[PDB]
């Protein structure tokens, strides 16, 4: 008879399979309704995220279709994986909602930054992130939306990536979505274009956040962000200014020039674990890697491959999380389609279950 069951949670009607019970929602209150439940069949706890109405507009279905198809066919330690997908409606007529279950994680990367950590833990967390993005870049996907709230870790400091970002499609910084400007690159904020090193900037800001305990570049508005970057890092050299668009090229030069601060005073030894030569040398190496990754000019930005071979990170090097086989997604398309086609397109995968 019935294979789905109902409960009204978080001001919303939630209906999924009976295998999961004792629904407990996330208290974060963030967009995307997800609750924690326990799956009886395989004896593991699960996180379940509901699509409210995937087809409210063209922006929704495009991102919803993207994340389902690619999460189904990439399989990596540092990227979150998909276990089951289903929707209660059995025909497309009233098919209107979709649910996604996946492996549960203990916490966000945000809260992990609050608790003091050590170099062994910090680096392994970054190592995982770089091979998470390196596995994505090899597939041809630029995240550009990396932030602590899109990153989850477990009790063993195993890190997994929650989001697939925009997959290198949209280049706008403020869309109809992300509540964070802080971790975004200088090129994206200036609309100068992006390459594969854009994401290196955001892992640099996240890494710097662990050391200090606060957001590295806190910007109240779109343009405060740029001011905060150059208040601490210094004004860029003229060669960087040439490629900028003239309308806002003018503005950067007319904006005041700041010499900037060096990473030793940006990241002092007090915030690091210290008093040891191992600690002092690990404090050096951490700051040195921050310098290579927190570069305004994209051309001197350290690559993810070189970042993995940095002494601070290479201690965890083993090819199977890093040098994985590239995931292949041949249904692939660069095009946008009808709203009715969108439901029919996603209906195929959820009903070919
Ligand atoms: C950090 C940031 C922050 O999150 N800080 C503390 C905090 C406050 C309130 C709630 C939470 C919270 O709910 N955390 C949390 C709870 C459960 C889970 N479980 C979970 N597991 C697997 C998968 C998912 C998931 C996956 C996909 C979509 N949705 C959920 N969920 C998780 C991961 C997290 C935490 C802030 O809120 C602001 C302040 C910040 C920036 C800060 O102070 O950093 C220094």
CB 258 within 8 A of CB 231: yes
Max CA distance (Å), the chain: 71
Closest CA to 297 of 226, 222, 237: 237
Q: What is the DSSP string of 90-114?
A: -STTT---EEEEEE--SEEHHHHHH
**Does residue 27 have its Cβ closer than 6 Å to ligand 1?**
yes
C-alpha 51 – ligand 1 centre gap (Å)? 19
243/299 Cα distance (integer angstroms): 12
Note down the domain range covering 243.
107-322
**Does residue 192 have its Cβ closer than 6 Å to ligand 1?**
no
**Does residue 104 have its Cβ closer than 6 Å to ligand 1?**
yes
> 34 has which bridge partners?
49
What is the total residue count of the chain?
Answer: 353
Q: Which atom of ligand 1 lies at the shortest distance from residue 108's CA?
A: 33
Query: In this structure, how many other beta carbons lie within 10 angstroms of the beta carbon of residue 335?
Result: 4
Q: Which residues contact 146 (CB under 8 A, 6 or more apart)?
A: 129, 133, 165, 183, 199, 202, 203, 206
**Does residue 150 have its Cβ closer than 6 Å to ligand 1?**
no
C-alpha 326 – ligand 1 centre gap (Å)? 30
Quote the tokens at residue 223. Answer: 């343009």
Q: Which residues contact 333 (CB under 8 A, 6 or more apart)?
A: none
The CA R_g of the chain, rounded to the nearest whole Å, is 22
**Does residue 110 have its Cβ closer than 6 Å to ligand 1?**
yes
Find the distance separating the first CA and the last CA of the chain, reported in whole Å: 19
Catalytic residue among 39, 145, 163, 199: 145
Quote the tokens at residue 48. Answer: 């379940």
16/135 Cα distance (integer angstroms): 32
CB 124 within 8 A of CB 321: no
145 given a catalytic annotation: yes
Q: Which atom of ligand 1 lies at the shortest distance from residue 214's CA?
A: 45
CATH classification of the domain holding 137: 1.10.510.10
Q: Which atom of ligand 1 lies at the shortest distance from residue 104's CA?
A: 22
CB 148 within 8 A of CB 335: no
Q: Which residues contact 263 (CB under 8 A, 6 or more apart)?
A: 287, 288, 290, 291, 294
**Residue with CA at minimum distance from ligand 1 atom 18:** 107
**Does residue 105 have its Cβ closer than 6 Å to ligand 1?**
yes
Closest CA to 197 of 235, 241, 146: 146
Angle between helices 339-351 and 58-73 (to 10 degrees): 30
**Residue with CA at minimum distance from ligand 1 atom 5:** 111
Mutate to test the pocket of ligand 1, among 38, 110, 115 (most ligand atoms within 8 A of CB): 110
Coil vs helix vs strand at 254? helix
**Residue with CA at minimum distance from ligand 1 atom 41:** 110
């Amino acid at each position: 008879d019935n294979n789905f069951y109902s409960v009204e949670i978080g001001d919303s009607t939630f209906t999924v399979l009976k295998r999961y019970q004792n629904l407990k929602p996330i208290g974060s209150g963030a967009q995307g309704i997800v609750c924690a439940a326990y799956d009886a069949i395989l004896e593991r706890n699960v996180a379940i995220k509901k699509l409210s109405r995937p087809f409210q507009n063209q922006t929704h279905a495009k991102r919803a279709y993207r994340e389902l198809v690619l999460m189904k066919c990439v399989n990596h330690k540092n990227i979150i994986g998909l276990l089951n997908v289903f929707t209660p409606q059995k025909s497309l007529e009233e098919f209107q909602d979709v649910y996604i279950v996946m492996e549960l994680m203990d916490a966000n990367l945000c809260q992990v930054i609050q608790m003091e950590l050590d170099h062994e833990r910090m680096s392994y967390l970054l190592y995982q992130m770089l091979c998470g993005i390196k596995h994505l870049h090899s597939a041809g996907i630029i995240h550009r939306d990396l932030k602590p709230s899109n990153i989850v870790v477990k009790s063993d400091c195993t890190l997994k990536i929650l989001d697939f970002g925009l997959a290198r499609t949209a280049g706008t910084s403020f869309m109809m979505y992300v509540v964070t400007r802080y971790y975004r690159a200088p090129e994206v904020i200036l609309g100068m274009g992006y390459k594969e090193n854009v994401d290196i900037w955001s892992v640099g800001c996240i890494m710097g956040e662990m050391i200090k305990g606060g957001v590295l570049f806190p910007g109240t508005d779109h343009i405060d962000q740029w001011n905060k970057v150059i208040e601490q890092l210094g004004t860029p050299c003229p060669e960087f200014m040439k490629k900028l668009q003239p309308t806002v090229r003018t503005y950067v030069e007319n904006r005041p020039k700041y010499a900037g601060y060096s990473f030793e005073k940006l990241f002092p030894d007090v915030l690091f674990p210290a008093d040891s030569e191992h600690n002092k040398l690990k404090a050096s190496q951490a700051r040195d890697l921050l310098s290579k990754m927190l570069v305004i000019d994209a051309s001197k930005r350290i690559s993810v491959d070189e970042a993995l071979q940095h002494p601070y990170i290479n201690v965890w090097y083993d090819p199977s999380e890093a040098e994985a086989p590239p995931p292949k997604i041949p249904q692939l398309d660069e095009r946008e389609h009808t709203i009715e086609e969108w439901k029919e397109l996603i209906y195929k995968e959820v009903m070919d279950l």
